[PDB]
Amino acid sequence: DDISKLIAACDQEPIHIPNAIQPFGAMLIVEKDTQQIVYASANSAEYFSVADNTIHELSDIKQANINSLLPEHLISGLASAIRENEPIWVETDRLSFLGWRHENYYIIEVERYHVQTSNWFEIQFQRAFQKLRNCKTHNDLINTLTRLIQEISGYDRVMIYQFDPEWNGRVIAESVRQLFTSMLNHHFPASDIPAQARAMYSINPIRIIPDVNAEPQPLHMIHKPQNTEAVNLSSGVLRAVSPLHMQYLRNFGVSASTSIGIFNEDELWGIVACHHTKPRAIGRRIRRLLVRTVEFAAERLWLIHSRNVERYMVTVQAAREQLSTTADDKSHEIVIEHAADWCKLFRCDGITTYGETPDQTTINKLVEWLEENLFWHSHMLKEDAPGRFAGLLAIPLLLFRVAQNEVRTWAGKPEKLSVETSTGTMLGPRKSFEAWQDEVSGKSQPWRTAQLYAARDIARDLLIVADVMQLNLLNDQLADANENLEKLVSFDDLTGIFNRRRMEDRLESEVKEAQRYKKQFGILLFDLDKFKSVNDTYGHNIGDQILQNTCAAVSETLRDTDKFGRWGGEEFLIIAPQTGMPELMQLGERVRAAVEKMQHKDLPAVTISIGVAEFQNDTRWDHMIDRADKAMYRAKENGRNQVCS
Amino acid sequence: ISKLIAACDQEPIHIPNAIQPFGAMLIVEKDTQQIVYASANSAEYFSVADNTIHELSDIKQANINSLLPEHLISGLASAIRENEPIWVETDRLSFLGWRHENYYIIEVERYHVQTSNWFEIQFQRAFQKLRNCKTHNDLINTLTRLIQEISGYDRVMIYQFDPEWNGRVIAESVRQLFTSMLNHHFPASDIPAQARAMYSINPIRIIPDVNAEPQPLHMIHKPQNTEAVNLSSGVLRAVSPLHMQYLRNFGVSASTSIGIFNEDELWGIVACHHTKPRAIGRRIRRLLVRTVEFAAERLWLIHSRNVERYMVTVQAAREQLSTTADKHSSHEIVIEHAADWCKLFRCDGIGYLRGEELTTYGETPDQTTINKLVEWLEENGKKSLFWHSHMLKEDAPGLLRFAGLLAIPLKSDSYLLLFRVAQNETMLGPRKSFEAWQDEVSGKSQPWRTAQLYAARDIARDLLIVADVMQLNLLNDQLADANENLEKLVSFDDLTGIFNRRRMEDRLESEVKEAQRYKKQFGILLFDLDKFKSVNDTYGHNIGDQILQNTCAAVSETLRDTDKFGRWGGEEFLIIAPQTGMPELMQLGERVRAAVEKMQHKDLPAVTISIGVAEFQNDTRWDHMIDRADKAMYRAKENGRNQVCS
Numbered sequence A: 001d002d003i004s005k006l007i008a009a010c011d012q013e014p015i016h017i018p019n020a021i022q023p024f025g026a027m028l029i030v031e032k033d034t035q036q037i038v039y040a041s042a043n044s045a046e047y048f049s050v051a052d053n054t055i056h057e058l059s060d061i062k063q064a065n066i067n068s069l070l071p072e073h074l075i076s077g078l079a080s081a082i083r084e085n086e087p088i089w090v091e092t093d094r095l096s097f098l099g100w101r102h103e104n105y106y107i108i109e110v111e112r113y114h115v116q117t118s119n120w121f122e123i124q125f126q127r128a129f130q131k132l133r134n135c136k137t138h139n140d141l142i143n144t145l146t147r148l149i150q151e152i153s154g155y156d157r158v159m160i161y162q163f164d165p166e167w168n169g170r171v172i173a174e175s176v177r178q179l180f181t182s183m184l185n186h187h188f189p190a191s192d193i194p195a196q197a198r199a200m201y202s203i204n205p206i207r208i209i210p211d212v213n214a215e216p217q218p219l220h221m222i223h224k225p226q227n228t229e230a231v232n233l234s235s236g237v238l239r240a241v242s243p244l245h246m247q248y249l250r251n252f253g254v255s256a257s258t259s260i261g262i263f264n265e266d267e268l269w270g271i272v273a274c275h276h277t278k279p280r281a282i283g284r285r286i287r288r289l290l291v292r293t294v295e296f297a298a299e300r301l302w303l304i305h306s307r308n309v310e311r312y313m314v315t316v317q318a319a320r321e322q323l324s325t326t327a328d329d330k331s332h333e334i335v336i337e338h339a340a341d342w343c344k345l346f347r348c349d350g351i352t353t354y355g356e357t358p359d360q361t362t363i364n365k366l367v368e369w370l371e372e373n374l375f376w377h378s379h380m381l382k383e384d385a386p387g388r389f390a391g392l393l394a395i396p397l398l399l400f401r402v403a404q405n406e407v408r409t410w411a412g413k414p415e416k417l418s419v420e421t422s423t424g425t426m427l428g429p430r431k432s433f434e435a436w437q438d439e440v441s442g443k444s445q446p447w448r449t450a451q452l453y454a455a456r457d458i459a460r461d462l463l464i465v466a467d468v469m470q471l472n473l474l475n476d477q478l479a480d481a482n483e484n485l486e487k488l489v490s491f492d493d494l495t496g497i498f499n500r501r502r503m504e505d506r507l508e509s510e511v512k513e514a515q516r517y518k519k520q521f522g523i524l525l526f527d528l529d530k531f532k533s534v535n536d537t538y539g540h541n542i543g544d545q546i547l548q549n550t551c552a553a554v555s556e557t558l559r560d561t562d563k564f565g566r567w568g569g570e571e572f573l574i575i576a577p578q579t580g581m582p583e584l585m586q587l588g589e590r591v592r593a594a595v596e597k598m599q600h601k602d603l604p605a606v607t608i609s610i611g612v613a614e615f616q617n618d619t620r621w622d623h624m625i626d627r628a629d630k631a632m633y634r635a636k637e638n639g640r641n642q643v644c645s
Numbered sequence B: 001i002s003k004l005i006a007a008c009d010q011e012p013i014h015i016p017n018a019i020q021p022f023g024a025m026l027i028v029e030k031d032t033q034q035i036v037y038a039s040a041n042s043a044e045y046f047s048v049a050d051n052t053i054h055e056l057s058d059i060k061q062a063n064i065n066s067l068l069p070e071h072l073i074s075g076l077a078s079a080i081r082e083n084e085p086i087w088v089e090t091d092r093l094s095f096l097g098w099r100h101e102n103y104y105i106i107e108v109e110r111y112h113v114q115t116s117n118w119f120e121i122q123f124q125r126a127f128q129k130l131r132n133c134k135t136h137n138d139l140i141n142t143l144t145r146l147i148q149e150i151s152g153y154d155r156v157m158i159y160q161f162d163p164e165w166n167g168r169v170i171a172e173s174v175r176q177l178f179t180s181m182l183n184h185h186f187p188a189s190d191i192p193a194q195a196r197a198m199y200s201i202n203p204i205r206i207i208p209d210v211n212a213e214p215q216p217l218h219m220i221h222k223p224q225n226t227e228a229v230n231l232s233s234g235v236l237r238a239v240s241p242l243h244m245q246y247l248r249n250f251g252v253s254a255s256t257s258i259g260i261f262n263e264d265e266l267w268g269i270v271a272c273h274h275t276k277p278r279a280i281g282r283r284i285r286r287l288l289v290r291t292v293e294f295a296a297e298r299l300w301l302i303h304s305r306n307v308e309r310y311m312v313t314v315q316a317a318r319e320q321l322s323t324t325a326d327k328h329s330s331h332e333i334v335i336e337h338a339a340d341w342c343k344l345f346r347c348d349g350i351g352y353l354r355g356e357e358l359t360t361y362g363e364t365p366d367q368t369t370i371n372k373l374v375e376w377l378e379e380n381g382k383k384s385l386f387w388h389s390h391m392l393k394e395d396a397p398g399l400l401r402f403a404g405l406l407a408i409p410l411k412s413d414s415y416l417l418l419f420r421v422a423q424n425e426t427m428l429g430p431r432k433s434f435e436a437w438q439d440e441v442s443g444k445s446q447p448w449r450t451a452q453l454y455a456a457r458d459i460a461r462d463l464l465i466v467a468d469v470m471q472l473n474l475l476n477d478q479l480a481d482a483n484e485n486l487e488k489l490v491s492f493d494d495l496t497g498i499f500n501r502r503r504m505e506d507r508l509e510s511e512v513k514e515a516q517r518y519k520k521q522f523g524i525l526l527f528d529l530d531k532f533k534s535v536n537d538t539y540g541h542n543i544g545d546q547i548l549q550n551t552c553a554a555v556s557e558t559l560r561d562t563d564k565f566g567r568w569g570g571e572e573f574l575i576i577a578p579q580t581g582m583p584e585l586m587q588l589g590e591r592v593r594a595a596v597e598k599m600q601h602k603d604l605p606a607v608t609i610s611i612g613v614a615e616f617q618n619d620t621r622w623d624h625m626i627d628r629a630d631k632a633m634y635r636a637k638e639n640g641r642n643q644v645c646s
């Protein structure tokens, strides 16, 4: 647009080489090699006449010698300087000199000066420093800075102007003695300080305009220089002001100004702006006191910001420990317990949902577009199909910010003014600074890096905890399946007692022990009597029901050492360790009587015939089963329901 | 001198009732406005305000308005806060006064106007140079050099206090007119609590001449309160003769020191020694203190940004652990990164124990000692908590070289340890002091600063988690692998590779239900080996079992694909034949019985089966069918073996 073109044209004016100065001093430019005064400001006579009573008009300077004009210390100091743009301050009783070396030149600015002897500045320094050290908060620091600067400088209005990333500004603190309207929280456009001017603070942190209506004095050529290109003046204070900005200050109701740049390392963070409603000069000592105060206040402010980051990281670690304590006691469960805390942690509105969120369907459309296209974070990109909501940080392996329309007050409505300057046609300054409002529909707060990494860390721990609940559940269920399939391999489905295999194993180990340690044990091998008659007359279901009954009757009779299992078909085995043949036969009698006398329960009466064997220094368990077996068979021959050895 | 060293810590240095002679002092009662004390040399300074003051006694005739400026009196009258000195100058005299309880204390010094920009230039240069420092080191060295350039003192040092109030000289700027003091430590006893506390009242202390004769306070008029007045808010307060002697033994004739405050905490001191007496005016004092104050705020900003970079480092390490896990073991990860963790935790060694495995890096005791430590922790009951010490020999007595230990307990289905090496490398003096400090840190490790501890619990948290995940994943792989084998054992038979008893009960039950839904027709064939006990006992188990395998091999080739064939009990088998009526069912039974008869003997006996057969006859339970097929099987067995019966 034509606006953009006009604002860009401001950069054409070379504000560092205006070949003129403000008239609150005088300036000489001297060629180092020839030691010849090559430039003098039109007002040089009225200052250097004090050094040289032969100086009457400007033209007399051409006839003068610099040793007649400069103090001894300034001359030696300029000769000694190898580094460029390092001003040297040297005073007489009536003049105050600031000189520096720039390429081939020495630039010397001189101001009239009165000697003034007191501890005022030292007391100011101690008090300002103590008051800034006492600030614990961004707010307290910036307001303390505004009051300190106003009291030191005496300016009618003092502001803290903070730059945003696009170089627009907001006034964040203010102190206004006389009747002025409050510019507090007013926004200013980037055009108001072009890049070329913001760049000045890096050469000299203070800029002084003691009189917006003072007539600039141009530099006149005295002797001819070997190079006629304009000399850079930006290191001093006397450099002339772009009439655009003189007019800007006029339109602002300001008659004199001073500003100091606020630097975070090499970055211009903002400025301290000082307006006065009548002309006002400030001496070199008040200037130094100002810049030192802003520099001490800035280090303090950055320290305050840095401590805020530490406090926030402590909160993040308290959150990650809280998450860890909850997961051990009880993953969406984890999300529900702490989300009110997390909303503070992440300065977000919505978080399975909590706080302000889209409905499940819109949330799934969100998810889906991310699946189509790490985390993702932005405030109202509008790069998708809208669902109210403007900020989203989504870690799929969701954090929501509602749009927050922000009314901004500007210091004047914009104007597309044109002005004809020397360097071309460019934007003229707005005529009104009256308050004027816009708002940003559809944007959210930007994501701070500290919040970003806290969020990536909370999501990382959550994913791990879901994985651990997972693996623990799968271990519980595979362990349960292994429990069932291991019971099925060892026991018999019907009767729920050791199958043949487990009885062979137990019997084998009882034999090995008894052979190793000379222990005594015996086995009981019994069978159900006339069982086929039960099966054919009553059926297998009734017969199997009898097998279950008989197992229940046998298991209640046995001692804790004995092991009881199903050997084959309707044959069962009992292993009685630490039992001699007498008590062994006794156990066979109690068992035999137990199966006879059990409850019939609408089923036939049942009898078992038991053979018995004793450990007789045997090698293998197979022999013992044979003895108990043929013994059982003699029990079958003498009439069933018997115990035989 | 020794008798004084016996009781130096108790000495009340704030109330010596004397001043150093680089000025004079008046003490005035606030209410009556009477001079009640004057320093013994008061005549020579106040003779300047009042040329009638000849001896000290003339002060008794004086009125405070005759000696003090109007600005000083009104400023004192308006002050409600105590101990905030007020600086007021005349053409010949320089006044500092403050209110303390009942009194106004006024210190006065002779004074000379400096008309020059020397101070503003010095200050700007100091600020620029400190602002250029990006590191702790650069800042402390720049500050020592600047303080020397401003104060003019032959030697300038920065003492940093440790948590126990010991001090270390960490920067120095010294003409070789003195010996180098860099890295010397002094014990906390060398600056008593009362002397460290004075910096909070006045940040600067000046001793222009160790050999100047102190001037006592004399009573001028009588005070309503007879107790000694506290003088600590000014600069003239007299110096403990013990410490004057300390500086004498050191070759120091004058000193200045400034406190370095982190908020209200005394972090260290800027000490300035000179080899001959040396005065410093009020403007140089203020310039010095302002410089230390700007430098201190800078240093705290540098430390705070270092904390930020350290937390970024910790987070980069915990992500690295997660990247490394993707190794087969937990001890594999520890071996790869423990040197980084030693940097991360500022410790000399680490040991990780997990079940039967032990890993060490750096300086550690041998494995056995590590087991004595573990056991002693789990014995004290202190195992479950975190535990840490910077003095093992006194905290954990009797475990003999190493001095620091941080032990993180880890619990699953079990430790991470950090080891730190001890610190090692009668006239008053810094040689006795440096060996006094050696005694205080004997067996004491560097204390565990808090930022490293939480780095350790957080690194350990991920270690326990990743070890647990490798564990649970391996154990789940093993439980899943075994269940396949135990599922082969539950559904199949050991010797025949054919369905178990269970699988035939289940198949039969489900076949009955299925036939019950669609009124479909199926039958079962129940066969047995004939005189098999006689075969087993005549030929043995090896031959007999191979016969069972032979018979299963022969039958499986007989079956149709729909039929299900399983081993029912002992030597009894079942065939479930879907889509088969009783005629075709009997046909299948004859083919099966004949199939088992003609098989290869292979030097083994001839074998025959007897088959019962049953058909689905509107049955409820699989029980009824087994009974029917069973009685049929028995009629075949009874009527001459090798038969099929319905």
Ligand SMILES: *C/C=C1/C(=C/c2[nH]c(/C=C3[NH+]=C(/C=C4/NC(=O)C(C=C)=C4C)C(C)=C\3CCC(=O)O)c(CCC(=O)O)c2C)NC(=O)[C@H]1C
Binding pocket: B005, B008, B009, B013, B181, B185, B186, B187, B189, B190, B191, B192, B195, B205, B238, B239, B240, B242, B243, B246, B255, B256, B257, B269, B271, B428, B429, B430, B433, B434
């Ligand atoms: C038990 C009390 C003692 C004591 C008292 C005392 N000291 C000071 C001032 C000191 N003393 C310092 C001690 C040092 N330790 C060292 O290793 C070195 C060597 C470089 C020194 C100097 C010390 C550092 C200070 C302050 C700074 C300075 O160096 O000046 C005071 C305060 C004096 C006052 O002005 O009131 C007291 C009371 N001195 C001890 O040595 C022990 C015995």
Ligand SMILES: *C/C=C1/C(=C/c2[nH]c(/C=C3[NH+]=C(/C=C4\NC(=O)C(C=C)=C4C)C(C)=C\3CCC(=O)O)c(CCC(=O)O)c2C)NC(=O)[C@H]1C
Binding pocket: A007, A009, A010, A011, A015, A159, A161, A169, A171, A188, A191, A192, A193, A194, A197, A207, A209, A240, A241, A242, A244, A245, A248, A257, A258, A259, A271, A273, A274, A275, A426, A427, A428, A429, A430
């Ligand atoms: C096309 C060029 C434009 C232009 C030029 C311009 N502006 C400056 C200097 C300043 N502008 C400032 C702006 C503010 N002053 C305030 O008090 C506030 C309130 C918060 C703002 C936003 C400031 C502070 C300066 C510095 C000078 C000063 O301190 O007063 C210059 C450079 C001036 C110089 O030193 O030569 C130039 C060239 N401004 C535009 O509006 C357009 C027209």
Ligand SMILES: [Cl-]
Binding pocket: A098, A237, A284, A287
């Ligand atoms: Cl200046």
Ligand SMILES: [Cl-]
Binding pocket: B096, B235, B282, B285
């Ligand atoms: Cl002082």
